[PDB]
Amino acid sequence: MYTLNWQPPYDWSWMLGFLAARAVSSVETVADSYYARSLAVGEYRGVVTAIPDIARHTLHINLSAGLEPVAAECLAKMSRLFDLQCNPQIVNGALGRLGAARPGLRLPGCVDAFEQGVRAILGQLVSVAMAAKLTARVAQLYGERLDDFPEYICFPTPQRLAAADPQALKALGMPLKRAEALIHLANAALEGTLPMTIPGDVEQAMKTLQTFPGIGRWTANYFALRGWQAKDVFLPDDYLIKQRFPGMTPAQIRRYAERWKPWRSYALLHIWYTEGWQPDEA
Amino acid sequence: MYTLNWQPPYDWSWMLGFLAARAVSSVETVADSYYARSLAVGEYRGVVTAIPDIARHTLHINLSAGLEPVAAECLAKMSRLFDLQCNPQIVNGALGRLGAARPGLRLPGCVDAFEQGVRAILGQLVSVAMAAKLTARVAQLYGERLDDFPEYICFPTPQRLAAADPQALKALGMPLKRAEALIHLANAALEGTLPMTIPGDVEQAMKTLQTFPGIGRWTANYFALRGWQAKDVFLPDDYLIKQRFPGMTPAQIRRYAERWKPWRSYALLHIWYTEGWQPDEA
Amino acid sequence: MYTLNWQPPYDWSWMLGFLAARAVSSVETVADSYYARSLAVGEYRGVVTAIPDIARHTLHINLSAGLEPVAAECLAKMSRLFDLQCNPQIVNGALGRLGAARPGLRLPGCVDAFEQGVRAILGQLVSVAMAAKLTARVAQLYGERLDDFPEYICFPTPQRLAAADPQALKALGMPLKRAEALIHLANAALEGTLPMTIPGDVEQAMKTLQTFPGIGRWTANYFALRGWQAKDVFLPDDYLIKQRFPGMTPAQIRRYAERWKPWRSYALLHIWYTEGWQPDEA
Amino acid sequence: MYTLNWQPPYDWSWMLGFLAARAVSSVETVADSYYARSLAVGEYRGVVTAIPDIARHTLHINLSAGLEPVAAECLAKMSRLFDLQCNPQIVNGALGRLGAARPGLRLPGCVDAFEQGVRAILGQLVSVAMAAKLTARVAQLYGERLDDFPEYICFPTPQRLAAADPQALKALGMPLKRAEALIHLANAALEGTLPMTIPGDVEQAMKTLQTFPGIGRWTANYFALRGWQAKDVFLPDDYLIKQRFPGMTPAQIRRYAERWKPWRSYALLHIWYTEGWQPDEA
DNA sequence: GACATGATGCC
DNA sequence: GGCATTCATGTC
DNA sequence: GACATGATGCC
DNA sequence: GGCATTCATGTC
Missing domain, CATH: 1.10.1670.10 (Helix-hairpin-Helix base-excision DNA repair enzymes (C-terminal))
Incomplete structure (x- = not known):
């Protein structure tokens, strides 16, 4: 349906692979030829399906009726996730051989900064596969399911985790602190203290984040990278x-x-x- | 030449009219059949042009190639500006009479919450035309002209306005406090303190906002309305x-x-x- | 067994009467001719007895054995409690007819600035009678008893109230927020952020107290008056x-x-x- | 005139010796058999003299007519300055060897927390001698010379030092930061932020003190020692x-x-x- | 990994 | 000595 | 209009 | 009484 352009080369296997090693059970669905997930934009929702066209260096995006009223924002989220904006040879030109091996490498962003914030936190200390299992459990419990697509479940919203109880979260398999860090994050979201968009002064912006409980300089740097596409x-x-x-x-x-x-x-x-x-x- | 949907009716006259009165020279152009302006997404720049298609219940949008890498976010910014999600059949069914005469009404949003913040402030205690001239100055002095289209000019980014001389600003016609407020606002926008998107709790967000120098309840509300599109x-x-x-x-x-x-x-x-x-x- | 003189006149029937209505059971004993109370200066405990010798305008202070290693401090407390520094001439000359009624009128201070803090907050709303009852209840729950004087109990230290359970204090007959205030005052005392001695700028000092939860303008003034004898x-x-x-x-x-x-x-x-x-x- | 008790032994030579080495010209006087210094308690000023009576195990203290109205507090200040409360049997017993050779050892206190703070600061990095003359210069400048005894000047008050030009002090012979340190300490004092008395949590109070510019852990400690006699x-x-x-x-x-x-x-x-x-x- | 704590130089 | 910054520790 | 100051109810 | 919020009011 909707379509967006990107500039060649684009390593979709690498990208789809990366996204797949972190896919979350019942929220995302990654295949060799497309990425698909639940998505919320205010009260609006449905499923987003993205299919690359290696041939026309184009990306096709399909939205379920529930998301149509916000089609545009949906598209913006996808473009941020996939890094379509990337001009591969401006980047590679400055990275010499460091990237020569795979010039189609793109920065895996996110479809929501808060979510990415939650994602980067559960990723502390543990393995990629574990952080996935973890985030799934948190999703399974606090995430709202789709009426239109039962198989799918929306990522937990800020206000649903804000009201969440530490002990409950902890139970899912994370230290008491990690859980509190998640409950804090959700509040800064409702209050708009957590930047949902790449801020002008990224460093200062990051410093502010490290003052947040449970968020160290690693969590802040990685979030900057995924949540803001810094x-x-x-x-x-x-x-x-x-x-x-x-x-x-x-x-x-x-x-x-x-x-x-x-x-x-x-x-x-x-x-x-x-x-x-x-x-x-x- | 992209395209976006909207549910009818849609008083296009009313909208454009509303945008024309507050249009800032060099920055925006508002004709009775199309709206166009200078846009900047990070370091990508160009010129947007929306052309409502009443027949199709469609909004056509062409993009200056300098904005093609970031077309998706651009399309998203326009949809927020024109309130493309609005299902009038729902809103009017809710207000009943109050909205019976202008069922095609939409909330005029903005292209960037920071810009709209500046605009709100410079809109304090003055006529519309007045403010749209004051602002026009600011955009002339701190704006990034385009090379692809010298005729237009990008709204002052927060970095160009963050490091601005209060007197430099004041001298274009505004109390010193007013010039100071824009300087502050510009800062919060560099360290992600200015919520660039509608927060979960808009009351809280506004209350916070009010602690910003040069911002009162009126400015907070008008900001929440146009800036966040609450x-x-x-x-x-x-x-x-x-x-x-x-x-x-x-x-x-x-x-x-x-x-x-x-x-x-x-x-x-x-x-x-x-x-x-x-x-x-x- | 100790003497401190004062300048005449000194209305003792008035001083004692005042200290009587506000006297706290099991901590203070007030009669027509003497004043007595438990007193603790750190780890030093004991009872203090004050006997005015009107004839020779000298106050006779007796100290239980346990307080003798800190007699000077006790004497100083006693003297701040009774405003012995007062110069009836200067105040009455400066006041005129206003004080022609009772020239012996003195400013009744306290013995411990923290205690007074706890009194002021409790002295909120309820009557003087009620206050003394309420205060005594707290002393009973958190005060240290004296072996040598089983009938007396020391006023609660910041160290006991800081650790208090707001619900416990609440059950004594005070709103939750009021108990939360005592605890805060107690903690303030622990970190040394509660002026135990009249501060250079009484005004600024008071403005800072009002920032404390539970302290408004009235309490902050009554505290300054009685606690610092401003x-x-x-x-x-x-x-x-x-x-x-x-x-x-x-x-x-x-x-x-x-x-x-x-x-x-x-x-x-x-x-x-x-x-x-x-x-x-x- | 007045007499205070002390428990034996009391190494008077050592004590008077220690104060002597840090005696401030025009403020203090230290002799083999007595100790004298200026002293102001509010608007009451005069000279205090302390004369130990080895025979009767007591400290005799005379006050000039200026301080008699606030005499009891002068006695308390002296009791803090000379550690009269100290029970050698307890400390030594517990201390063992350490205090075996000089069991009359005492904690040289101060007669005013603020002044002491000043001293702790001025005594930084330089020798005891430097500090003394350094301090002396400060006193001769922002001090209040006594009329009754002109060779004596009351150590400068907070209000006075808070309002001193940091460059005037720099001149007396100290870095510009050591000077702003005094201006700061003095402001804290004006508003009660400087504990003028031993706190409940001495650890937490010292931690707080180090936030004060110019004050580190060393100073914060030395201060707890002489200033609060911790x-x-x-x-x-x-x-x-x-x-x-x-x-x-x-x-x-x-x-x-x-x-x-x-x-x-x-x-x-x-x-x-x-x-x-x-x-x-x- | 977050977080509190312990181990050069500058001015 | 206060103060800034960068390792290096060590629970949880 | 922002923003100091002063001058009704819900705890 | 603390305290959050509301209705004038004067200023820049």
Whole structure:
């Protein structure tokens, strides 16, 4: 139905793969040729299906009737998730060989910042597959199901988690703190203290976030990257990044990684996916 | 040449009219058959042009190639500006009579909540034409002209206005406090303190807002209305509203307005743009 | 066994009577000729007895054995409780006829600024009789008893009230918010944010107290008057006072009292205990 | 004239010796057999003199006519300055070896928390001698010279120092930050933010003090020691202490010292005054 | 990983 | 010594 | 109109 | 009485 353009190359397998390693049971559905999920925009809802057209470097988007009144915003969310805006060779041109291996690499964003906020928090300490299982449990319990599509369930809204009880959340399998951090986050959402859109001054914006309970500099950096699609942010405290720069302290990794300015968010993703990348043997 | 749907009726005359009176030179163009303006999404810039198609119950939108990478968000910004989600058959069924004469009414939104904030402030205690000239100045002095279309100019981003001299602003015609308020607002917009999207709790959000220098309840409400497009807001502190509700106080008005919940914003528009209106004896 | 003299006149039947209506059971004993109470200065405990020797305008203070390692401090407390520094000449000369009735009128302070804080808050709304009852109940629940004087119980420390259960204090006959105030006051005392001695800028000090939950303008003034023995404070928003100035709004009364600087506290006392008194409608 | 009791033993030579080394010209006078200094309690000023009576186990204290109205408080201040409450049997008993050679050791207090704070600040980084003359200059400038005894000047009041030009002090001989520190301390004092008396939670009060500009943990501690006469503080950051504990980080010294509570303040002193002192190797 | 705590230089 | 910043610890 | 100040009910 | 909210009122 609706269609959006992107600029070649676009590694859809990599993107669809990435999104799939984090897909949430009953909220998302990832296939080799399309991504599909529940979606809410105020009281409006339904399902969004995105199908790439490698041939016409186009992305087709289908909305269920429930979402039609807000079609546009839906489209905007998808474009932010997929990073259509990305001009692959402006980025690659500044990343030399670091990306040469896969020039179609895009920044996996999100369809909702609050959700991404919840996602980045449950991702603390644990594995990607576990954070997925976890987020599913939280969704299963606090997320509202679709009348129109039973098989689907909407991601928990801010006000549903705000009223949630720590003990209940904790029960799902997370420490008491993690749960409280989630209940705080939802309140800043209702109050509009959590930026749902990429702020002008990202750093300051991030600092503000780290004052939030349960949100450290890692949670803040990663959220900046996914929730805001911040393109020039690196992660010196990331598990892997540590293991990718063996023998270095957070400020040398940051001080090192600052050579990929202003596209560090991309340099980060490349390093994550270059199987055996060791800093330049110089 | 994209296209967006809308449910009829839709008083296009009324809308454009409303947008024309407050149109800012170099920034916006409003003809009786189309609306066009300068737009900026981050660092992407160009010019938007919407052309209502009454036959099709459709809004056509063309995009300056400089905005094609971010077409989706652009389309979303227009849909918010024109209130494309509105199911009038629902709103009017709710207000009954008050909206019987102008069933095609829509809430005139904005293209960017920050811009609309600036606009709200510069709209304080002055005629519409007045403010649309004051503002036009600001956009002339702190705006990013386009190369693709020199004729237009982008609204001042928060970074260009954040680092502005109070006197520099004041000198275009506004108390110093007013120039100060825009400076503040601009800051919250850099550290994500200014909610760029309708928050869950709009009362709370507004209350917070009010602590912002240069912002009172009137400005908060008008901001929530145009900036967030909140549908159940009313301005009992407004100049004309006082006139429409003779000898009645903010409180009296406010609760009389309670009869229109959850669509007090539409009710407002109907009363404003309906000269000679007056409350009942019950 | 200890003497501290005073300048005449000194209305003792009035001082004691006052301290009598407000006397707290099991903590204070007040008769026609002497005053006695439990007293604790840190880990030092014991009873204090005050016996005025009108004939030789000297006050006889006796101290239980446990307080002797801190006699000086006890004496100082006793002297702030009885306003022995007062110079009847200066206040009465400055006041004129206002105090011609009772020149021995003194400013009744306290023995511990925290205690007084707990009294002031409790002295809220209820009658003086009620207050003493309510206060005594708290002392019974949180006070330290004395081995040598089983009939006496020490007034509760901040260390016990900070740890108090608001519901426990509530069950004693006070609104939840009122108990939440005691606890806050108690905590303030622990971190040292409650002035235990008259502060350089009484005014600013008081303004800061009002920021405390539970403390309004009245409590903050009555605290300053009794707890710091500030001599130039007035209670324009007090009950009885309002009666003393019929038809006058706090600001009026208050503008009137300016005529008494800097002995407004003393002024207040006389006007309070001069039943007839009325302003000069000139 | 007045007499205060003290429990034996009391090493008067050491005590008077310690005050002497830090005696401030025109403020204090220290001699083999007595101690004298100016003293103002509100608008009551005069000179205080303390003369120990080894024979009768007592401290004699005379006050100039100016302070007689507030004499009891002068006695209390003196009792705090000379630690008259101290029971050597208790402290020493518990302290063991440490206080075995000089069992008459006492905690040199102060006669005014504020002044003491000032002293703690001015005494930073420089030698006891510097601080003394440094302080002296401050007193001669913002002080209140006594008419009855012109060679004496009352240590400057908060209101006075709060309103001093930070550059005037810089001139007296101190960094501009050491000066703003005084202006700040003085403001806190004007409004009651500076605990003029020992708090319930001494730990929490010190933590708070360090927020004060110019005040660190060292000062915050030294302040709790002399200003509040806290008996359980240690100074693991003192230049000399670090020397008495060679090759031990503050946290280590700190933990070792835990063996002297609740009298770590005394232990400190003892240790301070023992050249070849060193912790037990085991 | 969040978070409190413990271990160079500058001015 | 206060103060800023960057490692390095160590529960939970 | 924002924004100080003063001057009715619900706890 | 604390306290949040409301109706003038004067100012910039």
